[PDB]
Short mmCIF file of C-alpha atoms (C1' of nucleotides) and ligand atoms in Angstrom, two decimals:
data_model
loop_
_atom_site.label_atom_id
_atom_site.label_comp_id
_atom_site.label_asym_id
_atom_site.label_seq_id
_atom_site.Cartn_x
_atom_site.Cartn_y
_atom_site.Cartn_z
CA UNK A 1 116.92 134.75 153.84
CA UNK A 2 114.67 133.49 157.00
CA UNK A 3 111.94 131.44 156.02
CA UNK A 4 108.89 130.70 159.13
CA UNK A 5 107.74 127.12 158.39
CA UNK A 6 104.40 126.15 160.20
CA UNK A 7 103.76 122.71 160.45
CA UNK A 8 101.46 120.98 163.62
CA UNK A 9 103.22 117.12 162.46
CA UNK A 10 106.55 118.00 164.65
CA UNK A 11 107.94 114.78 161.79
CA UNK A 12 106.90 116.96 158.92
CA UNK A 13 108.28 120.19 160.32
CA UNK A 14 111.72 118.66 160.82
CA UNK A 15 111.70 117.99 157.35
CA UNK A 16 110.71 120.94 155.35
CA UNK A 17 113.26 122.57 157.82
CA UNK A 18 115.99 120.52 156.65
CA UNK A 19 114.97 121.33 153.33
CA UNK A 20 114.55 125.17 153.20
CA UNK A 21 118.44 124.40 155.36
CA UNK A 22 119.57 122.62 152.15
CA UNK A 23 118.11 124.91 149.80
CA UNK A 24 120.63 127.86 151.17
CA UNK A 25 117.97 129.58 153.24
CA UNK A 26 117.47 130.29 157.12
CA UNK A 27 115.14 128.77 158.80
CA UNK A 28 112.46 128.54 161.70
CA UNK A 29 110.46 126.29 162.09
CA UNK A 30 107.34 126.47 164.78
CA UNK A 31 104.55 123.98 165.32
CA UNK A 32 101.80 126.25 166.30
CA UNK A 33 99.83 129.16 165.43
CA UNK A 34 100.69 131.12 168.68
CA UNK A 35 104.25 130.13 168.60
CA UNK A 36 104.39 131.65 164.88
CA UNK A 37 102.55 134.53 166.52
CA UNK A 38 105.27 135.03 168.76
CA UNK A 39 108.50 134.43 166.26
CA UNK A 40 107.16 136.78 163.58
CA UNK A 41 106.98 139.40 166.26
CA UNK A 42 110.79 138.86 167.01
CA UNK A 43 112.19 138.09 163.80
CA UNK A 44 112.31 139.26 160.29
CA UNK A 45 111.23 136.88 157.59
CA UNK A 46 110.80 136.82 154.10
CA UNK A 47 108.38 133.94 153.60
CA UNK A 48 105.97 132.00 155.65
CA UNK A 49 105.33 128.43 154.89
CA UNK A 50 101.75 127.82 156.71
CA UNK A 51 99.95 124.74 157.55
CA UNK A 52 95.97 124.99 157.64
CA UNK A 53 95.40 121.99 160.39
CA UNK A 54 97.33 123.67 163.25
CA UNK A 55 95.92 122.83 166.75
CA UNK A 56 95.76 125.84 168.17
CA UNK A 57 93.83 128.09 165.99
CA UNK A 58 92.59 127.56 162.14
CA UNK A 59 95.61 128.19 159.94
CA UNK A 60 93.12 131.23 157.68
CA UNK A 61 91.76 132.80 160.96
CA UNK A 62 96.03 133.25 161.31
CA UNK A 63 96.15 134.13 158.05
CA UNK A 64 93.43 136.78 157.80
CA UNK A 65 94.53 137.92 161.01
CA UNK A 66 98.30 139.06 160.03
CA UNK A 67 96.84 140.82 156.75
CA UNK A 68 94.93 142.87 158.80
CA UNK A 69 97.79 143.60 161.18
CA UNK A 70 99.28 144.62 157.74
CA UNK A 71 101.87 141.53 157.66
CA UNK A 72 103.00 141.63 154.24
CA UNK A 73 105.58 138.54 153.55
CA UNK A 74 104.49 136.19 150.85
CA UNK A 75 103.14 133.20 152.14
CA UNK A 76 102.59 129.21 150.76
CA UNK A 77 99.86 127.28 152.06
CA UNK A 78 101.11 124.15 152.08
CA UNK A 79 98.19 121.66 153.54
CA UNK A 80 96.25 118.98 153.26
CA UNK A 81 92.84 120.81 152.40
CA UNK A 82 92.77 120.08 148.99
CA UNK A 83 89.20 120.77 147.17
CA UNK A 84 88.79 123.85 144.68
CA UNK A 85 86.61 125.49 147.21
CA UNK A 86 89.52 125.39 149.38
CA UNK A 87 92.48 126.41 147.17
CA UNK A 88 90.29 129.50 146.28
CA UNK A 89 89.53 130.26 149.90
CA UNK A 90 93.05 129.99 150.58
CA UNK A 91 94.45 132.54 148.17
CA UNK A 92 91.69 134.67 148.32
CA UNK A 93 92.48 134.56 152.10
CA UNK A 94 95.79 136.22 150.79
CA UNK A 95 98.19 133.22 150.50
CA UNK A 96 100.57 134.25 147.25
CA UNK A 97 100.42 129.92 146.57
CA UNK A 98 98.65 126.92 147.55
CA UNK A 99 100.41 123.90 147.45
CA UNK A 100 98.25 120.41 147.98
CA UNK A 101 99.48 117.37 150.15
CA UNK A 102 101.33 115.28 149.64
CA UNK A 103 103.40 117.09 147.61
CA UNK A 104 106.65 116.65 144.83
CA UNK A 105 109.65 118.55 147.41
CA UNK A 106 111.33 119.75 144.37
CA UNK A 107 108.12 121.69 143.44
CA UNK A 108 107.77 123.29 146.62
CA UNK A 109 111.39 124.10 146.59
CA UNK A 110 110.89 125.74 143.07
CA UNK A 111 107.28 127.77 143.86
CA UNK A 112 109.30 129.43 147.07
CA UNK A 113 111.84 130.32 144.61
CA UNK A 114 109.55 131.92 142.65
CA UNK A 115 107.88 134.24 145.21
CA UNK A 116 111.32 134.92 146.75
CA UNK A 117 112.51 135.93 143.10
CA UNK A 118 110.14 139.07 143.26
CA UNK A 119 110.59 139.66 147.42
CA UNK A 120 114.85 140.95 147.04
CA UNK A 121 113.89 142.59 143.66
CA UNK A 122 111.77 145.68 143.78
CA UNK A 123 114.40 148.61 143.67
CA UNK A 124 113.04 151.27 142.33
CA UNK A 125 115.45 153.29 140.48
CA UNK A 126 116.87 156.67 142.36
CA UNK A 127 119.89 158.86 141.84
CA UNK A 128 120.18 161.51 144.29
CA UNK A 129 122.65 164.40 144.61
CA UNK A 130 122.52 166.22 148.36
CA UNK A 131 118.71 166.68 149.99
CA UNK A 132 116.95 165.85 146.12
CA UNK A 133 115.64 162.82 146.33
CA UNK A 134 114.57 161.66 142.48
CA UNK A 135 112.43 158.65 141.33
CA UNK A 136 113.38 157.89 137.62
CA UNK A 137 110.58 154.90 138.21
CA UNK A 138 107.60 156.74 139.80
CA UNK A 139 108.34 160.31 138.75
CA UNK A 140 108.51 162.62 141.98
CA UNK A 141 110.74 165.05 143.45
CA UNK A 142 111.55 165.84 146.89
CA UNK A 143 113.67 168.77 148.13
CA UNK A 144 114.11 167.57 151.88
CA UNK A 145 110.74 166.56 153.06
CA UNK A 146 108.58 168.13 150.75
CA UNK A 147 107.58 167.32 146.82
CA UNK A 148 108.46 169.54 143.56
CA UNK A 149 106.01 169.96 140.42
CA UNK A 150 108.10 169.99 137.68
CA UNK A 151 106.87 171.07 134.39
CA UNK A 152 107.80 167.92 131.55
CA UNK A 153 110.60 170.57 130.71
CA UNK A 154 111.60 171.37 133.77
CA UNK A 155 111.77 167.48 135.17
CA UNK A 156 113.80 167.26 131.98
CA UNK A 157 116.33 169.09 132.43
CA UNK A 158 116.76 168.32 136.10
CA UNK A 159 116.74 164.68 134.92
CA UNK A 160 119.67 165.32 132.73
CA UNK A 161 121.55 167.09 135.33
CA UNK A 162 121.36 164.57 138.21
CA UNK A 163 122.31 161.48 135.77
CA UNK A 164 125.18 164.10 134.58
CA UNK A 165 125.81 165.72 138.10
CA UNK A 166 129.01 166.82 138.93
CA UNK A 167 130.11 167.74 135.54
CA UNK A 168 128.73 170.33 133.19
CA UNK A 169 126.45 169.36 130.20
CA UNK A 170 126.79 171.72 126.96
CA UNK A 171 123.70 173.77 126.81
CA UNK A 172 123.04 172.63 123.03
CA UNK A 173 122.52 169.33 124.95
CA UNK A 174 120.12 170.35 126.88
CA UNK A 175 118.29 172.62 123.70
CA UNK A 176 118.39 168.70 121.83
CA UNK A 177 117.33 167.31 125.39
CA UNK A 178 114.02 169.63 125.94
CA UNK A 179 113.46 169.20 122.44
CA UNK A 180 112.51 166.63 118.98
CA UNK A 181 115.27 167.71 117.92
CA UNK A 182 113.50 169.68 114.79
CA UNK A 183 111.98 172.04 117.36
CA UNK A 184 114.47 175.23 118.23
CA UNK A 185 113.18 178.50 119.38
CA UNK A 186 114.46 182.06 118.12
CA UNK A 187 114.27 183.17 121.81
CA UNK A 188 116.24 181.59 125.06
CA UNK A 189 113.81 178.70 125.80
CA UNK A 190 116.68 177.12 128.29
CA UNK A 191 117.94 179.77 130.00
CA UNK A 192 114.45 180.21 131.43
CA UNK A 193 113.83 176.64 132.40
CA UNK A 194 116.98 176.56 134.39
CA UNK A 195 115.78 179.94 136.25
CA UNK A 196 112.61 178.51 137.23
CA UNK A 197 114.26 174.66 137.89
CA UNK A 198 116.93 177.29 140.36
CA UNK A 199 113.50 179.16 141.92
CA UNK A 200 111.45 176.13 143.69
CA UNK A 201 114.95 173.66 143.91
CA UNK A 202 116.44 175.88 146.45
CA UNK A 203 118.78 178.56 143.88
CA UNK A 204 121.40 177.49 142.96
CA UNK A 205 122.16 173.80 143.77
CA UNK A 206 122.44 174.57 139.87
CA UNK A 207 125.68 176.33 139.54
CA UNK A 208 126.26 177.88 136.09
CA UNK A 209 128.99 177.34 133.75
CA UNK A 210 129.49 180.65 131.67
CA UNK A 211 130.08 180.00 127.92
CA UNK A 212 129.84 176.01 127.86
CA UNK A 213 127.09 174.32 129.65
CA UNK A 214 125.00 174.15 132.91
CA UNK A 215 126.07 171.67 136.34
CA UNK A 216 124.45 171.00 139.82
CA UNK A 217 126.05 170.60 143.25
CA UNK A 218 126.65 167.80 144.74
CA UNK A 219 129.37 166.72 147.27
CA UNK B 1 93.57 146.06 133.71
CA UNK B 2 94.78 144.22 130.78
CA UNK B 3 95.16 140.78 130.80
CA UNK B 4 97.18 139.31 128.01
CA UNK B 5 96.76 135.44 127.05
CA UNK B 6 98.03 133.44 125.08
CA UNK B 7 96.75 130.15 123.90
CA UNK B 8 97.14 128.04 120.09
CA UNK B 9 94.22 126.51 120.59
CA UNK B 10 91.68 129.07 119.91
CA UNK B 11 88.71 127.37 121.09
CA UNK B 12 90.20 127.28 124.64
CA UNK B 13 91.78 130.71 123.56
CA UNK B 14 88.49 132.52 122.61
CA UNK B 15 87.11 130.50 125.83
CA UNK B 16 89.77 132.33 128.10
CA UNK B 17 89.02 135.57 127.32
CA UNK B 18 85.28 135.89 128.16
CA UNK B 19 86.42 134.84 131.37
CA UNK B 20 89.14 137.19 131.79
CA UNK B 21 86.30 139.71 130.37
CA UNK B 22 83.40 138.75 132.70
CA UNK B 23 86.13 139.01 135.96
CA UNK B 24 86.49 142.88 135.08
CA UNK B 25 89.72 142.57 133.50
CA UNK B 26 89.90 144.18 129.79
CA UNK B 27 91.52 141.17 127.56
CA UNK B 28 93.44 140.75 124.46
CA UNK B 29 93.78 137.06 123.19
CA UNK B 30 96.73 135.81 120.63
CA UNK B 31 97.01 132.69 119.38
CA UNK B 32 100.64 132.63 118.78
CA UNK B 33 104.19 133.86 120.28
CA UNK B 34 104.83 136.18 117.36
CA UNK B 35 101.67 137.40 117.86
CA UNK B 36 102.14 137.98 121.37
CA UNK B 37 105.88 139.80 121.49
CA UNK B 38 104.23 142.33 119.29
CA UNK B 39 101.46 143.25 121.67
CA UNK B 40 103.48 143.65 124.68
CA UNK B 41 105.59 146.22 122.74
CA UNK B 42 102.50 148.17 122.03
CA UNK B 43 100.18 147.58 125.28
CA UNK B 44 100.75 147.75 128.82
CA UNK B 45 99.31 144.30 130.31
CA UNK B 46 98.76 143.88 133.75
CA UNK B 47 99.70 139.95 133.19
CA UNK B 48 99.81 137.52 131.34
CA UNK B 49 98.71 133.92 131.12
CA UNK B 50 101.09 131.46 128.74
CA UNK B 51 100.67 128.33 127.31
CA UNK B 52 103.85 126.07 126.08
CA UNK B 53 102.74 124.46 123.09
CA UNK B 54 102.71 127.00 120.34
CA UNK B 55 102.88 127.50 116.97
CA UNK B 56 105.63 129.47 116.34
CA UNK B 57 108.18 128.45 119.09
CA UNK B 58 108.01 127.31 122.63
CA UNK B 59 106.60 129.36 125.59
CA UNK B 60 109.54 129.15 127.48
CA UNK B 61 111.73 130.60 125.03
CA UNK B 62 109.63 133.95 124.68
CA UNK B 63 109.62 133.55 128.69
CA UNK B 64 113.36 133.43 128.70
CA UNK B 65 113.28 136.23 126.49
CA UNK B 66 111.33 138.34 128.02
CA UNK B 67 112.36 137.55 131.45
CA UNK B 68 116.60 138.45 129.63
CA UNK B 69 114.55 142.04 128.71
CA UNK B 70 113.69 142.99 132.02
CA UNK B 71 109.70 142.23 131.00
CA UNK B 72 108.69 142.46 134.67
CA UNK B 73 105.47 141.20 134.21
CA UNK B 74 103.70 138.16 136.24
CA UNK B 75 103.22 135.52 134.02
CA UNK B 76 100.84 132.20 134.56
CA UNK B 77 101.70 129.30 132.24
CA UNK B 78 99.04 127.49 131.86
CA UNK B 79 99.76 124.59 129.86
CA UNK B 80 98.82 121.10 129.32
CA UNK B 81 102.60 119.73 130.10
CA UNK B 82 102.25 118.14 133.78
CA UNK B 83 105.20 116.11 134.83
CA UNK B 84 107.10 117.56 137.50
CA UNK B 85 110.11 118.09 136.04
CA UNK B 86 108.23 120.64 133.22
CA UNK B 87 106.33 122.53 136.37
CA UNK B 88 109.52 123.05 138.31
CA UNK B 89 111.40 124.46 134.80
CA UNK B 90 108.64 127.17 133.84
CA UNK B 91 108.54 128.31 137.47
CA UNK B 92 112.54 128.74 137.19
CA UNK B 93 112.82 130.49 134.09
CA UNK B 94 110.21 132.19 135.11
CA UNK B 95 106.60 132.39 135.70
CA UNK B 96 104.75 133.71 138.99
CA UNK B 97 102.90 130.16 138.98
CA UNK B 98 102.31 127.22 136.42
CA UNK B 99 98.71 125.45 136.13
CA UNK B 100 98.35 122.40 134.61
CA UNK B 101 95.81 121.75 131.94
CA UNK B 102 92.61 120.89 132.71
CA UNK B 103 91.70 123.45 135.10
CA UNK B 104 89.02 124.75 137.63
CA UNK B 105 88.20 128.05 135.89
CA UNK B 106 87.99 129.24 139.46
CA UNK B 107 91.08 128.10 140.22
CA UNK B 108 92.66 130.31 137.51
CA UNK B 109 91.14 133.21 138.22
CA UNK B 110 91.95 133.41 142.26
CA UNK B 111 95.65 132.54 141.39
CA UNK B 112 95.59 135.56 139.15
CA UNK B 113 93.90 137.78 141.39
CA UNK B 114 96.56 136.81 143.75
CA UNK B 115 99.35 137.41 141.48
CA UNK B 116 97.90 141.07 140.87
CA UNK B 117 97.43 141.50 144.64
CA UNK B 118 101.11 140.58 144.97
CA UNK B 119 102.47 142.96 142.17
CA UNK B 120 100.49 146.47 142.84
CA UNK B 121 99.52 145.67 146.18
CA UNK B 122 101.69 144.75 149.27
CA UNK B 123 99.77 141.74 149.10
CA UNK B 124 97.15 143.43 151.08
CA UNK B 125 92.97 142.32 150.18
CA UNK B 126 92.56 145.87 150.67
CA UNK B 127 93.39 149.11 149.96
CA UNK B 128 93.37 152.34 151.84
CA UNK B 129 93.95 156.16 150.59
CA UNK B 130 92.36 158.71 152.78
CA UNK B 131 88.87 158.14 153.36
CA UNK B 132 88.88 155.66 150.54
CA UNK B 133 88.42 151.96 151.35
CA UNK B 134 89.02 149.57 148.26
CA UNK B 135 88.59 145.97 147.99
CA UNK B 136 90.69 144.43 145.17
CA UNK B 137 88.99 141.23 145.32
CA UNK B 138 85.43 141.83 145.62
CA UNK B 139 85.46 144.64 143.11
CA UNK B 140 83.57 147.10 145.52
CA UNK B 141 84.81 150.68 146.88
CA UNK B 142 83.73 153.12 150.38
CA UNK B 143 84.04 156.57 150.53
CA UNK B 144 83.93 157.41 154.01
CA UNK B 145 81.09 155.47 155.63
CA UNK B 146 78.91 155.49 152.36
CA UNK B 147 79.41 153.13 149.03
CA UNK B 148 80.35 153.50 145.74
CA UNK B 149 78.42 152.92 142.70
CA UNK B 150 80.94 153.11 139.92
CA UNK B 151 80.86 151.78 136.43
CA UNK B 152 83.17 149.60 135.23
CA UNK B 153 85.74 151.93 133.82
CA UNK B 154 85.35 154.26 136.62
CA UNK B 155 86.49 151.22 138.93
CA UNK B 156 89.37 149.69 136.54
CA UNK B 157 90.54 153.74 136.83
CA UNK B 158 89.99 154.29 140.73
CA UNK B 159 91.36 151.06 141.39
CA UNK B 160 94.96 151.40 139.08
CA UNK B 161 95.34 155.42 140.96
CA UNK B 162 94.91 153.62 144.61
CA UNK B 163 97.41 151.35 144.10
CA UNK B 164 100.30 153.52 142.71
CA UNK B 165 98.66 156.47 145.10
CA UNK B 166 100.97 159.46 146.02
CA UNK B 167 102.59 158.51 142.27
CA UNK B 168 101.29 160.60 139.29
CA UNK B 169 99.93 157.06 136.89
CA UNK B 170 100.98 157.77 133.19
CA UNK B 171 98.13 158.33 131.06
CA UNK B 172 99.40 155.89 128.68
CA UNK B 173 98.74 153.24 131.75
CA UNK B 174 95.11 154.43 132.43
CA UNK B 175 94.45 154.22 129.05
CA UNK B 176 95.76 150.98 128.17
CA UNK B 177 93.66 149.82 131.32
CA UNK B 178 90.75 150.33 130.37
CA UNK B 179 90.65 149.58 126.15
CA UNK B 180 91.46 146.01 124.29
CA UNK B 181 92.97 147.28 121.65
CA UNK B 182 89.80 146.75 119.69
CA UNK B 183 87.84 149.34 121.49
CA UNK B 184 90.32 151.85 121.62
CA UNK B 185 88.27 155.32 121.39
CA UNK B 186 89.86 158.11 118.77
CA UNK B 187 88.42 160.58 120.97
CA UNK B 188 88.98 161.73 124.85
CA UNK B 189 87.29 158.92 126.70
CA UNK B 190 89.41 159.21 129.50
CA UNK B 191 89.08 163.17 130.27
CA UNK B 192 85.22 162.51 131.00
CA UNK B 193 85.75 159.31 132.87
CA UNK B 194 87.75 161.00 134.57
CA UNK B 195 85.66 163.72 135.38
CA UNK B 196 82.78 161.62 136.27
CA UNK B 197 84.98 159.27 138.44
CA UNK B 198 85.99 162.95 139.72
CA UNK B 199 82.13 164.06 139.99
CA UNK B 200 81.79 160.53 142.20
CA UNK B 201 84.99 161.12 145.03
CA UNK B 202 85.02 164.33 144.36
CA UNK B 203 86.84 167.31 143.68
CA UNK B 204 89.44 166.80 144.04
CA UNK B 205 91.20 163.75 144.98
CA UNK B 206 92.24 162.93 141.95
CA UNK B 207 95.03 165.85 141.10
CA UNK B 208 95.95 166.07 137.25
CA UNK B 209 99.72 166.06 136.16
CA UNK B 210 100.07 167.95 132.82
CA UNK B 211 102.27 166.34 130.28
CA UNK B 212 101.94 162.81 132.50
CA UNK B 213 98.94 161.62 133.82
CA UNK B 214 96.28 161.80 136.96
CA UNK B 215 97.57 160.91 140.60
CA UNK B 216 95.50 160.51 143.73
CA UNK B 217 96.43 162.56 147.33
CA UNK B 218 96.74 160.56 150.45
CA UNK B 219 99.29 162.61 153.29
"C1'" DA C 1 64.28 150.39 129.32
"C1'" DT C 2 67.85 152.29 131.63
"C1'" DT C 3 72.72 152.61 132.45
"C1'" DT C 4 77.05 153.32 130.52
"C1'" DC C 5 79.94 154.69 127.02
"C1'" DT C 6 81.42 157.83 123.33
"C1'" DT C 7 81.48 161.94 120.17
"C1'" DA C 8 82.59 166.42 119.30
"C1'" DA C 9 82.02 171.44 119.97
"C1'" DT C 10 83.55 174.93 123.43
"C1'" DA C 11 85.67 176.88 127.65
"C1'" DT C 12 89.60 176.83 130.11
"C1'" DT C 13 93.67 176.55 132.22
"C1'" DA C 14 99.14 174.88 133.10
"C1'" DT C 15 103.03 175.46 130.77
"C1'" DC C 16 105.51 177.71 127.43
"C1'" DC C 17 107.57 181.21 124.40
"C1'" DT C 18 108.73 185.89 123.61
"C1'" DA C 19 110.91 189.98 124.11
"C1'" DA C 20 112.62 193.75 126.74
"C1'" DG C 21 115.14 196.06 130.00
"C1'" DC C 22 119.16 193.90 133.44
"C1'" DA C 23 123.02 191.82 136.09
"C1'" DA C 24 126.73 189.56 136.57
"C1'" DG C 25 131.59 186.80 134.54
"C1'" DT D 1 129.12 191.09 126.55
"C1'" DT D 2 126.88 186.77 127.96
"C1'" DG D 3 123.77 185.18 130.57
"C1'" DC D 4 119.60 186.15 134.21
"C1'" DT D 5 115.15 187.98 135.16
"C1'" DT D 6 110.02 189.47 134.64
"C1'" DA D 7 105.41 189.40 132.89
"C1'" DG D 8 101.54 189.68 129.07
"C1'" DG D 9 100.32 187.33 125.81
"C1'" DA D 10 100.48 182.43 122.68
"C1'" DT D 11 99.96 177.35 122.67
"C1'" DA D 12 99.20 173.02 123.76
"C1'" DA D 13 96.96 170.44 127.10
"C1'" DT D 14 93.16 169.01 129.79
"C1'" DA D 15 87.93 170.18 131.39
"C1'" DT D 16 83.51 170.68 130.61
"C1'" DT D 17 78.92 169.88 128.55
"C1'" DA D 18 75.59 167.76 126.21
"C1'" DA D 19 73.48 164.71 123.65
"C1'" DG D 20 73.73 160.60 120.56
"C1'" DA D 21 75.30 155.21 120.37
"C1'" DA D 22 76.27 151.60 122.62
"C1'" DA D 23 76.34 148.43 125.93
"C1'" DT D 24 73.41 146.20 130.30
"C1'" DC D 25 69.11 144.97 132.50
F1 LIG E 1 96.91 119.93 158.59
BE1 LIG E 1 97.35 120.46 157.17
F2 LIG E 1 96.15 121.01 156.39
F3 LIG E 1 97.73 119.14 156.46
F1 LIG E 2 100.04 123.36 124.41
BE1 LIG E 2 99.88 123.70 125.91
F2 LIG E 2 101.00 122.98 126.73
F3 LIG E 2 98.53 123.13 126.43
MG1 LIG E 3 98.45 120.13 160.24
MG1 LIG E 4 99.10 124.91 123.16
#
DNA sequence: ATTTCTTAATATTATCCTAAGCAAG
DNA sequence: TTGCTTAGGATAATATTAAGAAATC
């Protein structure tokens, strides 16, 4: 992953270069504020480690300035401005961590581990079958770029299907599925679920298997 | 939100949570591990602040475990063990940050507001949905060009449907927001809030999803 | 001293079941 | 024959009010 380091001590910078090198990640290192400016524009980077004494401009100005430009990468203050008053002013600023000079390596090394831990990880879960686009994590359907209601039956059994799809799922599934189990209607509760599923999902990307069970298209 | 902490010595422990309280946070305090893995079964916390030395058994092994669970919760350890080599091992099993005991109460509560700001927001101060400007930090919300006054519950509510705007927030989630467990109303608190929140912003921006939970409209 | 929160009785709607008269496999 | 289709009426679910307890100021 590329990690910006900012440092205004050229000696420093060399270093914490090497390091994020010898940790396994890529690295840039800059020793100004405008130079930064200029090599997040260019390049991608998940994680900027910022100095507050930079020469050039005041390392929270550049900090409170890329928020606002909606930068979103986590970022470590790593500096040399160490009171409480600081620290606060620092994360509040929107740093994710504030790390004081001089400073243990082998904690800095571990604290960017930690916010890069979080950065790869957020994958919210999807299975998709053609133009339906499912969230199993934030509960929303899409049939190409608009959004589907569907009723806590009708999301379901529509659930069921796309985690099935492909193959047909016997409808006494579905009847345990849509139901506690100790709850069965006298009247065909399924058969018009899957109508009304069929109506706003674009009938029939639900193709019907006569006898056994119900299936969606796919391929 | 929720804050969960957990601390053996009580004194500290009960000292915590009036904190946590008097930030805007709801809190529920445990003095023990045991104590703890049954509250996260039954609550939703927002986070959750650990100490090491513990009763029962050792912070870092209900980390681990939760952590092996897919518990994908931040987690500050604060904790009164300080030598490096314990700071970089919570952060790697592991927490979102480790603080070493004694503390700057302030320090505490900017590193969790930044650990929030990093988990539901993009790590943005701010948040923006439609005509409604939120900021996270200074508890304080603008509808169009005009303020906001909300109560406290109307916030922690307005607040949790910005952040996971455009997705319908269980009502479980709202709920669990805004109660400590010891508060937790038999009636429908959350319909009126609701509708007062709704009286407030309007109607409506705040679209109901039967069978789920509210969600807020921003395209 | 006044806001904010709850309680609980009543109106109200999405979603659901029901049944009847129909279309396919 | 089995499964699809429709709507008017049943049912949970959520809204509304209001005022009575709690919390803040
Ligand atoms: F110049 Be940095 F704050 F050490
Ligand atoms: F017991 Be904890 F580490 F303060
Ligand atoms: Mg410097
Ligand atoms: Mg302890």
């Amino acid at each position: 992953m590329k990690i910006l380091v900012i440092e205004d001590d050229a000696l420093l910078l060399q270093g914490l270069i090497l390091a994020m090198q010898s940790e396994g990640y890529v690295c840039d290192g800059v020793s100004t504020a405008h130079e930064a400016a200029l090599s997040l524009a260019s390049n991608h980077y998940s994680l900027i480690v910022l100095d507050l004494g930079l020469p050039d401009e005041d390392g929270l100005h550049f900090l409170s300035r890329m928020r606002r430009e909606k930068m979103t990468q986590p970022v470590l203050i790593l500096t040399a401005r160490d009171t409480l008053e600081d620290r606060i002013s620092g994360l509040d600023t929107g740093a994710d961590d504030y790390l004081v000079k001089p400073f243990a390596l082998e904690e800095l090394n571990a604290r960017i581990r930690a916010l890069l831990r979080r950065h790869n990880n957020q994958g919210d879960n999807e299975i998709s079958v053609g133009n339906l686009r499912l969230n199993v994590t934030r509960r929303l359907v899409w049939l190409g770029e608009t959004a589907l209601d569907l009723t806590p039956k009708e999301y379901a059994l529509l659930s069921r299907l796309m985690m099935k799809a492909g193959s047909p799922v016997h409808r006494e599934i579905l009847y345990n599925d849509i139901y506690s189990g100790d709850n069965e209607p006298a009247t065909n509760t399924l058969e018009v679920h899957i109508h009304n599923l069929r109506e706003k999902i674009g009938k029939s990307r639900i193709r019907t298997v006569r006898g056994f069970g119900y299936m969606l298209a796919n391929n």
